[PDB]
Structure formats: structure tokens, C-alpha cells
Design a protein around this ligand. Structure first.
Ligand code: ADP
Ligand code: MG
Length: 232
């Protein structure tokens, strides 16, 4: 297909240029698919937080973003909303393979992000899977998965020891809680993961804090990044 969805997508995209954060209080003030809006509304998410307001628009427009805001700010939806929309704009489906990698620092943090994604993205037609360790069972299922939520070590493992894993068609890389990723010692793991990905992609980096190392990474991982910070 689909001919109608192409028209709908085209209209959303014409409205990307007109995005103005001073006119945004609600998720529905951004130009978002009906499926994303339904999922947000069904999950009781209606008004945007400041970091969501200041980063979702730029991500919709295809830009690389470093978003910095303390814990509790709403960073998860700040990248998940753009993740869903990136694949929706392409009419991505389960047969299209790996479109988005979201990397979180620990198995519990990865799991928490995965749960938000499966609640808020439930009205979309993409597959989502969680890879966090704790084997071969995993590989069997994930070759077909559109959105993978991962921990850094397990992702690099899948990469190194799975012949069928490829990210040739990756659209977006997201680093969730990027300052913790780095403070755990995963800088070298991250660079190796990045060697296995296409340069052409969009990359979002979300961090709780302003650290030297995350700003350094924003140069290992990001193309002319849009820096955005929020406080108080
Ligand atoms: N737009 C919103 N409206 C109301 N609550 C929200 C919104 N976005 C996030 N939250 C809630 O605020 C809390 C923190 O969000 P979360 O993404 O985990 O923050 P962070 O990763 O920045 O620490 C969670 O309870 C989440 O459900
Ligand atoms: Mg978080």
C-alpha cells in the first residue's frame, strides 16, 4: 500500500516546519499520528513536560539531539514519541526489520523504558523487543523486531556472536540515560556498537546531567547536534 497514509504523512511533515514551542502545551499541539496520540491519551499523557516540549519537535524534524534534564523530567517520552513517528512516517512493519535501537544502562532501566514503549506504542503496527541478558532463545525472536531496547554489553554481544544481526536499515539510535551508560564504564563498548551501525542515521542522546563525557560522546555519536537543556 499505502496511498492514503502517504498523504497523511505528507501533511504531518508539512507541519514540522511550523513547530513553535511557545504554542505547545499538549502532545496534540505537535503534529503526531493518530495512533501515537491515541496511545498517549490511553496512557494518561496529555500535557508535555519541558524537556519533551523542547526536544520532540527537533527530533521529528530529523535532527540529532542531546537532551539534558534531571531525573523525573520526562526524558522517556521525549525520545519514544519521535521513535514511534520515525517508523510511522515510513509505514514500517514487522517484515521491515530493525529500525530503532534504544540503549539503556541496566536491565531494569531497559525494562522500564520498554514498558512505556509497549503501552504508548500499542496502536502502531511495529514490533518491539527487549534484550537485557539473564541466550540463543533471544536471537531466535529478535531478527524480526523493529524496535530493540538493549543494554550495551548484550547488544555488542548479539552483534559479535550473531551472524544474522544487521542494522543496515537502522533509522534511529537512542541512548537513554547516557550519562549513566558512560559512568558505568561503557564508553568503549558504545564506540564499538557505533562502528556496527550506519552513519546515515538519526541519533538521540538523553542525559540526567551535564557531564564532560556525555558532551564528548555527543561528538562520537552525533551529527551537528542540537543541544537542549532544561532546569528548574
Ligand atoms: N507528559 C507527562 N505528563 C505526566 N506525567 C509524565 C509525562 N511524561 C512523563 N511523566 C511521568 O513522570 C515520571 C518520570 O518520567 P521519566 O521519563 O521516567 O523521567 P526521566 O527519564 O527524565 O527520569 C514518570 O512517572 C512518568 O510517567
Ligand atoms: Mg529515565
Amino acid at each position: 500500500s499505502m496511498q492514503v497514509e502517504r498523504e497523511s504523512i505528507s501533511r504531518l511533515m508539512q507541519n514540522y516546519e511550523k513547530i513553535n514551542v511557545n504554542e505547545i502545551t499538549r502532545f496534540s499541539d505537535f503534529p503526531l499520528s493518530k495512533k501515537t496520540l491515541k496511545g498517549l491519551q490511553e496512557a494518561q499523557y496529555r500535557l508535555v513536560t519541558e524537556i519533551q516540549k523542547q526536544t520532540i519537535g527537533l527530533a521529528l524534524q530529523g535532527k540529532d539531539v542531546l537532551g539534558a534534564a534531571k531525573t523525573g523530567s520526562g526524558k522517556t517520552l521525549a525520545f519514544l514519541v519521535p521513535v514511534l513517528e520515525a517508523l510511522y512516517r515510513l509505514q514500517w512493519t514487522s517484515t521491515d526489520g530493525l529500525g530503532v535501537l534504544i540503549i539503556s544502562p541496566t536491565r531494569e532501566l531497559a525494562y522500564q523504558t520498554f514498558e512505556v514503549l509497549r503501552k504508548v506504542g500499542k496502536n502502531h503496527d511495529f514490533s518491539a523487543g527487549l534484550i537485557i541478558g539473564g541466550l540463543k532463545h533471544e536471537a531466535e525472536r529478535i531478527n524480526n523486531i523493529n524496535i530493540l531496547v538493549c543494554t550495551p554489553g548484550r547488544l555488542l554481544q548479539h552483534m559479535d556472536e550473531t551472524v544474522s544481526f544487521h542494522a543496515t536499515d537502522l533509522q534511529m539510535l537512542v541512548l537513554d540515560e547516557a550519562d549513566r551508560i558512560l559512568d558505568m564504564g561503557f564508553a568503549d563498548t558504545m564506540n564499538a556498537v557505533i562502528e556496527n551501525l550506519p552513519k546515515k542515521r538519526q541519533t538521540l542522546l538523553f542525559s540526567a546531567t551535564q557531564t564532560k563525557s556525555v558532551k564528548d560522546l555527543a561528538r562520537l555519536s552525533l551529527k551537528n547536534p542540537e543541544y537542549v537543556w532544561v532546569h528548574e
